[PDB]
Ligand binder design. Structure first.
Ligand SMILES: Nc1nc2c(ncn2[C@@H]2O[C@H](COP(=O)(O)OP(=O)(O)OP(=O)(O)O)[C@@H](O)[C@H]2O)c(=O)[nH]1
Ligand SMILES: Nc1nc2c(ncn2[C@@H]2O[C@H](COP(=O)(O)OP(=O)(O)OP(=O)(O)O)[C@@H](O)[C@H]2O)c(=O)[nH]1
Ligand SMILES: Nc1nc2c(ncn2[C@@H]2O[C@H](COP(=O)(O)OP(=O)(O)O)[C@@H](O)[C@H]2O)c(=O)[nH]1
Ligand SMILES: [Mg+2]
Ligand SMILES: [Mg+2]
Lengths: 427, 97, 45, 426, 92, 427
């Protein structure tokens, strides 16, 4: 059982630069690439005495990829895997979707199969991208399209980064996010949302780092990814693989958007004082103060839930805590889901990165639920998309790249149809 | 409460009285790291402010100390299995390979 | 259910602790029993 | 002589089978290396019911372990009493169903069941006079429920006259792991009522209950639950393995507990169960076994019998016991609460005595009560299945595979008429 | 005195025999475009190969094998150090 | 069985500062938080080798709170169990009840909920505050009110620091005291008064400390608190729980005000001097020279008494001493309570702190009684409230913070009603 991870965009490969740091530290791999079977789902045993990841970074600006080439992991990544174009898309869906992709995407999917061929029991692909950017949105959608044509039946997990409501780093990211999500609807199998204000609030509130950079963000995002692939890598009492998501978390094939959460996000000193038990971390993973997306599930109704447990946990107390939640009435499950939970238990405790801020913990929880607060997210983003589009601002950029207003209108109404869908199910 | 003075005689001994009988033994200053911890911290901070390298990108400045620190004492966290309250031992449900 | 769970743990701890305390208490009590038994000599028929 | 071949399906089936074969091997004294080391010659005469002599006293179990994920397989091989199973009997897929009954029943069965049928047919035609098949599996997962269901169907169409047990665990709303529990449980039960000879229903909710109240453990891991279900399975097939004053084979139990060919869902209890702290302060009499066996909080199902009627019942005893006390205690519990037993059948209690106790014990017992309280459990599942299927939750994962809507309708229909007939005889 | 440290190092790597040929693989791969390695990189490589040498000893080796015109301990000439290490390897 | 303790105001957390030092000494817990089941009611065990109290210090000025945070008890207290605002309430009930209380009380109420959940056999709450100030009175009464609407049935043992008649460290303390008690009536179930002049006279008379400070007061108050929770902590021949003050000492829903007393208050040398037995300490616990609140019980009539005994005490002599008291006619009881005594006996003798002025004693007694001299106290304070209120002095401060004249008038007449009630029950 093997899984390969592809990273699209400048945020993608920074997420990768944290995930693969965590994987190597988890399996005791030196940054040179070799140890001084459980790893087989990520690293291949090259040649002799050398483990090379199952990953492809790809980007259009050469700056950040070449920084990876000169970073600490110079030899830990195969030279051919880190693809890189000559000029970026520059915050432009059209420029990233019609001009430069037609050259780089053919080489990229020619190199992913040269990876899937080495694989034998491929569990699925999983993608990392920020839809706000240019190459993350456009080329990302172009790659996802040709992936669906080439493989189709294999699962394509997605961890995307939407623009935050009020904190934002761009202006045309509404246009980019919308024109990206029209393909993100019907091409990815499972899609997990990751906003940045939510992560900023977590690192400010819980970990009380007053000045966090993106590194700390990437660190705990890698904690989330590691915790939901740990069932493949290590062994537990009740394991769930990558196929279980598309079974137990998506009640209707067009509804795959899942809020994530993590607990306990605790610093070095608060570890000594809080007696970490399963009950209170199962509570802690449910407050809006500890979610990975700035939304409120109080406004929404949980359509399903998944609970990944790592460390010193027995099925007894996790079943006890999940009972208390099911009986509490502060949060409300949907009527059509009688058993809106799915638990998964793993024994390997989550490791720490020295220099990181989390402490050595005995047990952790990674919650992935499906709700209707996401239907609130898309509407709040649609509102400010039509705000700009009413004056046709920035449109000349895309039409200059060669596109038209047709996909503007059809992406707008496609989002409208999705809001109608979310309000329906949530009945 | 912290008993800063070594010999814990009495609460009212530290107060200033008119009488020299006790005024001799009232302590004036409590010297120790238990007090100087704050200046230790902030002097470390002023030192790292004063001595800085210009060409240290943040991305790589974060990783290098980590890659050194784990290399110093390499321990691989082995899978801990919660001991069930019985003579039976867990024998987990799955095993990787 | 958290109360009902912690109740069990506290009861178990206090049960085994009582076993320890009583095991300790038994030997001096038996000593006094022996002392006051020594006073009474049984008769010979 | 009379042969019992074993079948395990899924992760639950593999781990239960692991503890079951650990306990049986303990009973017959065979070491974890595979050689006999016991003392009494009673243990040699009835190991052909479970084992096959290889050479120099190597007895390998007559079991077929079946699953879809290597995690279960390696966990079996790693533990103690793991190096005694033959690797040919480890028929084992590679993709994995993963909580999808349709994958477990239509797509993966097509390429797995041919290999399992090869192994099991070789294992059956190897011994002369089969008593019957034994199946332990789960109704929550896919490769346990789905593949196990397909294997049950193919077996009952191949070897029709032989007996067949099925220990199935049913997921409860209190202890609820997965989301598609009803979509799996209802379809499996819809098949078990026409194919399986008799079914004995376990439930993890009741097991956690018992390990809290009776055993008074603090951290009841799955090992203890597998230990309880193993004690049940051993107590069931004890009479075939050891001579008694009143023998009782599986077919004898079936004919004395199944009055109607569709009423074959039993509930199980086990006794004695006492905590190690309360292990000194107890007596060991047949009254002390019966007062705990007939207790409602001792059943291994989530069905309170005091909400229903005992249609029939049975009690198997182990240990050198007095038949007079056995029968008079059965009479007393039968005549005291005359309202909990059906009227049109007098003498509702089948009894049996075997003179070999389980190791470490002097006197034990096992109970199988064919009650009409089991339709409480089936309603508790069918109401959730209606809650989903009224509204086509998750339906696309089953429709896009080959399964269609009418399978769900007929599954609902057979669920409803089964609880209807159980309700009729109440 | 750095030569004594180099001799102690080759004697340390005489044991765990895979660890010697592993180190020359490190100096070649973790090299710069020019044959220069950072002080942090050199210390990391020694620790990763599992050789424990006193930090003062590491400083002595760096000073002996330092690149010309650099600060005293900032860098290290990987090619010179490796060609000098091969000699002690074949001598031991 | 566990009990949690909250400390409000500048006086509250200085008292708990003594109280928690004593608890650490009694159960042998080092000030770094570990031992080198009787502690279970105060110190919870975290992980391996740690103990973290069930308490919250809170104050709006961070000065004395972070003095605790930089003391020796840094590792002992949970970092977030020391709540601290940003700016003081400044002897102002309205400022400490509406302006800053509204933002600090929600954080304290969530924290108390966490402590309660981490508790298992919660006996109740016990609070420590001074009503003369603003922080203790204002958001004290606010938190007491919100605790009543949250739990209610759980007893709240309130040890409040009332002002002395002539010795006073504030000016508007009458306005604050009346506004505090106005809600302390219907929200505290069992309220024990603690004055300051009375303890000054005690520390001058018996301990013959000629220039006492607050630390002496707090240390012996801590000795009293530990003496009345010792029955919950340790096994005794006849132990009483926290529920029996509620029953044995409150004859009416609005007569809950007690005079506390403690004996023997003896220094080191006078311990060698004096022959301590139960008759004289039972006698000494009744004259007003050993009461903790400056009033004369000779002017009033007792309603109900309770006596904790610690150490080598047999029920025989204590019964003889109370028998001699009831037949003594210097003090007189009310006619509606002929059996007005309550006894409780715990085995452990009270421990001493290094540097404290209390000597190692074989046995001690803590008396908590009810009388009507308290009705004399409230009148004495009420008269000096009217003197300022007639001229409308200092009122502009309170009405500027947001209150009006109605609260002054209604609190004035409510203490008038309580005056009439004590006069009626005294008949
Ligand atoms: N959460 C998170 N977001 C990031 C990170 N790095 C960049 N982003 C987000 O990426 C979004 C824009 O895409 P970028 O990655 O910056 O650039 P791009 O995707 O390569 O698109 P182009 O600039 O046109 O090439 C911004 O909204 C950033 O918030 C990161 O490390 N963590
Ligand atoms: N017995 C005793 N009383 C104290 C102590 N500290 C303060 N007080 C009393 O508290 C009263 C005034 O309230 P403060 O505690 O000073 O301040 P506050 O109640 O927190 O109100 P703010 O000043 O607004 O924060 C004074 O009359 C003191 O008598 C103490 O350590 N022991
Ligand atoms: N008694 C018992 N129940 C188990 C065990 N393992 C899993 N279960 C239960 O079985 C259900 C899941 O079944 P699963 O193992 O996934 O079936 P499979 O996927 O076909 O192998 C969960 O509700 C578990 O509570 C076990 O070892 N013993
Ligand atoms: Mg970019
Ligand atoms: Mg104050």
């Amino acid at each position: 059982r093997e899984v390969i991870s592809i990273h699209i965009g400048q945020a993608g490969i920074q997420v990768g630069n944290a995930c693969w740091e965590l994987y190597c530290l988890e399996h005791g791999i030196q940054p040179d690439g070799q140890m001084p079977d459980a790893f087989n789902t990520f690293f291949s045993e090259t040649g002799a005495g050398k483990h090379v990841p199952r990953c492809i970074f790809l980007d259009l600006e050469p700056t950040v990829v070449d920084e990876v080439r000169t970073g600490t992991y110079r030899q830990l990544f195969h030279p051919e895997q880190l693809i890189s174009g000559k000029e970026d898309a520059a915050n432009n869906f059209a420029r990233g979707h019609y001009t430069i992709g037609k050259e780089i995407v053919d080489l990229a999917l020619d190199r992913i199969r040269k990876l899937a061929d080495n694989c034998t029991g491929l569990q699925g692909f999983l993608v990392f991208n920020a839809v706000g950017g240019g190459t993350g949105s456009g080329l990302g959608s172009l790659l996802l399209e040709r992936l669906s044509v080439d493989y189709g039946k294999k699962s394509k997990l997605g961890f995307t980064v939407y623009p935050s409501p009020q904190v934002s780093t761009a202006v045309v990211e509404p246009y980019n996010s919308v024109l990206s999500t029209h393909s993100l609807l019907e091409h990815t199998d499972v899609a997990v949302m990751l906003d940045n204000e939510a992560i900023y609030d977590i690192c400010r509130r819980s970990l009380d780092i007053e000045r966090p950079t993106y590194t700390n963000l990437n660190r705990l995002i890698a904690q989330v990814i590691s915790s939901l692939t740990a069932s493949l890598r290590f062994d537990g009492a009740l394991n769930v693989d990558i196929t279980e998501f598309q079974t137990n978390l998506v009640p209707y094939p067009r509804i795959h958007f899942m809020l994530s959460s993590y607990a306990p996000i605790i610093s070095a000193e608060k570890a000594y004082h809080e007696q970490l038990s399963v009950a209170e971390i199962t509570n802690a993973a449910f407050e809006p103060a500890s979610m990975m997306v700035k939304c409120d599930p109080r406004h929404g109704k949980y359509m399903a839930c998944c609970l990944m447990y790592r460390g010193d946990v027995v099925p007894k107390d996790v079943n006890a805590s999940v009972a208390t939640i099911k009986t509490k009435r502060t949060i409300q499950f949907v009527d059509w889901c009688p058993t809106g939970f799915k638990c998964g238990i793993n024994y390997q405790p989550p490791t720490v990165v020295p220099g990181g801020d989390l402490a050595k913990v005995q047990r952790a929880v990674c919650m992935i639920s499906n709700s209707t607060a996401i239907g609130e997210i898309f509407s709040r983003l649609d509102h400010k998309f039509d705000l700009m589009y009413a004056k046709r601002a920035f449109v000349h950029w895309y039409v200059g790249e060669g596109m038209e207003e047709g996909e503007f209108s059809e992406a707008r109404e496609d989002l409208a149809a999705l809001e109608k869908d979310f309000e329906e199910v949530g009945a | 409460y912290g008993r800063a003075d070594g010999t814990d005689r009495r609460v009212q001994s530290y107060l200033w009285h008119g009488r020299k009988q006790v005024d001799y033994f009232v302590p004036h200053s409590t010297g120790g790291p238990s007090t100087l911890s704050l200046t230790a911290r902030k002097q470390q901070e002023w030192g790292t402010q004063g001595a800085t390298d210009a060409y240290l990108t943040t991305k790589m400045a974060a990783t290098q100390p980590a890659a050194l620190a784990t290399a110093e004492n390499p321990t691989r966290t082995q899978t801990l299995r919660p001991l069930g309250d019985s003579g039976l031992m867990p024998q987990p449900g799955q095993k990787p390979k | 259910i958290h109360m009902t769970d912690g109740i069990r743990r506290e009861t178990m701890k206090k049960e085994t602790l009582a076993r320890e305390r009583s095991l300790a208490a038994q030997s001096p009590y038996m000593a006094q029993v022996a002392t006051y038994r020594a006073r009474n000599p049984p008769l010979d028929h | 002589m009379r042969e019992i071949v074993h079948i395990q399906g899924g992760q639950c089936g593999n781990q239960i089978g692991a503890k079951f074969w650990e306990v049986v091997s303990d009973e017959h004294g065979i070491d974890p290396t595979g050689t006999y080391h016991g003392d009494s010659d009673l243990q040699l005469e009835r190991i052909n019911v479970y084992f096959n002599e290889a050479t120099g006293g190597r007895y390998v179990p007559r079991a077929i372990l079946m699953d879809l994920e290597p995690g279960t397989m390696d966990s079996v091989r790693s533990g103690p009493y793991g190096q005694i199973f033959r690797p040919d009997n480890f028929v084992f897929g590679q993709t994995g169903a993963g909580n999808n009954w349709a994958k477990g029943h239509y797509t993966e069965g097509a390429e797995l069941i041919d290999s399992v049928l090869d192994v099991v047919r070789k294992e059956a035609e190897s011994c002369d006079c089969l008593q019957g098949f034994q199946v332990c599996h789960s109704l929550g997962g896919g490769t346990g429920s789905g593949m196990g269901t397909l294997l049950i169907s193919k077996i009952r169409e191949e070897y029709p006259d032989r007996m067949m047990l099925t220990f199935s665990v049913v997921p409860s709303p209190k202890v609820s792991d997965t989301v598609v529990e009803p979509y799996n449980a209802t379809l499996s039960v819809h098949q078990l009522v026409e194919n399986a000879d008799e079914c004995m229903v376990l439930d993890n909710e009741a097991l956690y209950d018992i390990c809290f109240r009776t055993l008074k453990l603090t951290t009841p891991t799955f090992g203890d639950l597998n230990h309880l279900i193993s004690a049940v399975m051993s107590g069931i097939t004890c009479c075939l393995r050891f001579p008694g004053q009143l023998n009782a084979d599986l077919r004898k139990l079936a004919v004395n507990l199944i009055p109607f060919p569709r009423l074959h869902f039993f509930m199980v209890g086990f006794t004695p169960l006492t905590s190690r702290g309360s292990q000194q302060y107890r007596a060991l009499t047949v009254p002390e076994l019966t007062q705990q066996m007939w207790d409602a909080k001792n059943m291994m199902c989530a069905a309170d019998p005091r909400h229903g009627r005992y249609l029939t019942a049975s009690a198997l005893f182990r240990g050198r016991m007095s038949t007079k006390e056995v029968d008079e205690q059965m009479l007393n519990v039968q005549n005291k609460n005359s309202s909990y037993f059906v009227e049109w059948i007098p003498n509702n209690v089948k009894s049996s005595v075997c003179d070999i106790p389980p190791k470490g014990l002097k006197m034990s017992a096992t109970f199988i009560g064919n009650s009409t309280a089991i339709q409480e459990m089936f309603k508790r599942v069918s109401e959730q299945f209606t809650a989903m299927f009224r509204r086509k939750a998750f339906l696309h994962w089953y429709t896009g595979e080959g399964m269609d809507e009418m399978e769900f309708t007929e599954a609902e229909s057979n669920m409803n008429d089964l609880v209807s007939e159980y309700q009729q005889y109440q | 005195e750095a030569y004594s440290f180099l001799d102690g190092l080759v004697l340390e790597l005489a044991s765990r025999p895979g660890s010697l040929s592993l180190l020359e693989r490190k100096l070649v791969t973790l090299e710069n475009n020019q044959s220069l390695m950072s002080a942090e990189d050199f210390k990391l490589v020694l620790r990763q190969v599992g050789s424990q040498l006193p930090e003062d000893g590491i400083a002595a080796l760096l000073t002996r094998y330092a690149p010309a015109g650099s600060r005293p301990g900032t860098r290290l000439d990987a090619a010179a150090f490796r060609n000098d290490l091969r000699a002690a390897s074949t001598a031991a």
